[model samples]
Target: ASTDYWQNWTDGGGIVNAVNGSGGNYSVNWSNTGNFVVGKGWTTGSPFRTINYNAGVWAPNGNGYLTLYGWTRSPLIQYYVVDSWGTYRPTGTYKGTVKSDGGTYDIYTTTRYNAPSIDGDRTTATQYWSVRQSKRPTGSNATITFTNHVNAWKSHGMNLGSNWAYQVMATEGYQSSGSSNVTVW
Candidate 1:
């Protein structure tokens, strides 16, 4: 069965396809020349908790990321917990590093002024990122202790406002191509 929600956005040559099942399990594959994003998860991103995931990714070109992505309302923030990436790794204003779930992740923050957000278009938002210091092996199961990240961000003055929207495990491609099969609980 399909999950509560999935997003497939594309503005390129090839298309992005997805398959979903119970317990937030999903698969996404994209082969596009332009920009595209495919995501799957719950409609609401509240009560952040530890998440367990297993994924297999086949991405050999271009640039993209396999991340736990989500949004907040009060502060209107877009956040990512990147586990793996393609050719290019995403970067931003380096904040610091956090150790959690058996790994150390580099933290970064970026502001998107008057950009699209869960609220609507033309909204200013901040993007929080926790990129793994070492890429996790593809096709493996892992754990994400969300609270550890939240606390780390809070300590760095990057507070996630008290509101929530959608949260998903996603694969994003920019001028590239790839596929990801993820199961989350």
Candidate 2:
């Protein structure tokens, strides 16, 4: 129940060779390591895994910072913008900051850590995103392409709705190391 999953990446040395899924999903390309992570799953049909996706990774350069939370689910929606909880006391709805293509993000849906344990599945509402690396670009890369997000909360306006259908990509690490060769599409 805990062999996380990720696969898919391409373009001159990526996706190394993907073939593993189900209960113990598998795929890892690593090197000089520490908790490194990788993922890229896009469109397929299964009991339920990835859906309309695009994941990525490649770290261990030197922790400038980290905070990337992106997601979409079958009925669990979470939107993002980070670190701001003078003690989360809100009515929900603070559509203040947003600029895309890569930069500034400060949108909120609700989550002082009890917003339905993440929107409490009302029946289809998902959107989540958080960016650090000083606002974007710190997760070193050999790949910077893949975007299937159905508008993660669309700058807090919420256009969430899409039982997205497949594709799971990943990458994770703490004292983090490094790995090479991958897959994603």
Candidate 3:
């Protein structure tokens, strides 16, 4: 299985790292309070297939989330399917709720102004989010029905663009500390 590492960091001091383990599993840790992200997933476009994730020893101390993160082209949309989080939760204009993969998710849309995107830095984009109503349990296997969320978004008039970009199951943090062992496929 081919995998790509996706990351973002601010200039302020912080430590973040990810090491791929055997098979589709990886270990990630972050500390010292700064904006950072680290994860592994497919860089191939679209990647809309249903994804299964197993989390072991999951922990986050501050503002953070574990999510299925990705982007789309043309319209340049950044999307997140948040399975779990710590401290803070993302919110926006409430779109609706989607029942998928045996769970209900709250859909939201937010705009990013002059932010980093798959296209480039300082790019404006729209963000689509499907945050799970309840945090998924640690040390358990769960699935994100990506296509189901997409269809639900479309039904709400939050249609995605034609082109797809990189997709990753990511751990993102801001001024936070955390560690996780995750496997995705």
Candidate 4:
């Protein structure tokens, strides 16, 4: 099944009206002017009834924007654009990104799962050991390894899963291994 949300029908005239399942109202009489009325749930009624103004399409003359009008507040809502004739058309998706870890990872999905919990002593896990990326000794030959410990835990029906794939890195006697590290991003 799908979830539905509510959106308000905002009049460019600065007035906000609730656009719920039952519809809404506007104060400025648009029976004359031609303004653009855009918002959600415009199909139920005159969600966007534009009026003709000196500068072209404008909202009704007064103050009215979109607001919540339903008994229940929906988390989802549809967006629309009203034409000069007060006709509303659906708008496209709103694109944005969510960054994490001091701008390390940019999440773009609608929902993000939290990091899985770590079980047992991290050092005891042959396959799933934790290491501080930035604390590796510099100029030392340090070889990092990943065992199937994480996989083994998952096999036991445990939720200790990681979002990252497995990989390895080695310190080739470079500068002293400072505190640079990489874990589950």
Give me the candidate number with maximum lDDT. Answer: 3
Q: What lDDT does candidate 3 reach at residue 93? A: 89
lDDT per residue for candidate 2 within 1-185, as digits (tens), equals 23233433322222233335444333444333332223444433232322222223333343211222234455545433331111121225445544443554555555443222222222333334433123333223322222322243443456543553433334333332343222333
Candidate 4 or 1, higher lDDT:
1
Local distance difference test, each candidate: 0.76, 0.34, 0.79, 0.20
Per-residue CA lDDT of candidate 1, range 1-185, in tens?
23466766565456667665566677766665566557776678754566667886546367878888888877678998998888877889999999988889999999878555563335677899999987778677887888888999988989897887877777777777677777776
TM-score per candidate, in order? 0.87, 0.30, 0.90, 0.16
1-185: candidate 3 lDDT, tens digit per residue: 44554444443548777676776688778787666556667776453577778888579988878888888887878889898999988889899999988888999999978666674445777999999898877687888888999999999999787787778787878888889888877
lDDT of 1 at 49: 68
lDDT (C-alpha) at residue 132 in model 4: 24
lDDT over C-alpha atoms for residue 85 of model 3: 93
How many backbone clashes can be found in candidate 1? 0
Q: Candidate 4 residues 41-144, lDDT tens each?
A: 22122211221111111232222222111110122211111111112211222232222111211111122123111211112121211212122122322221
Q: Which residue window of length 10 is worst by lDDT in model 1?
A: 114-123
Model 2 lowest lDDT segment of ten: 82-91
Superior candidate under TM-score, 2 versus 3: 3
lDDT of 2 at 78: 45
- Per-model clash counts, in order, read 0, 32, 0, 32
What is the TM-score of candidate 4?
0.16
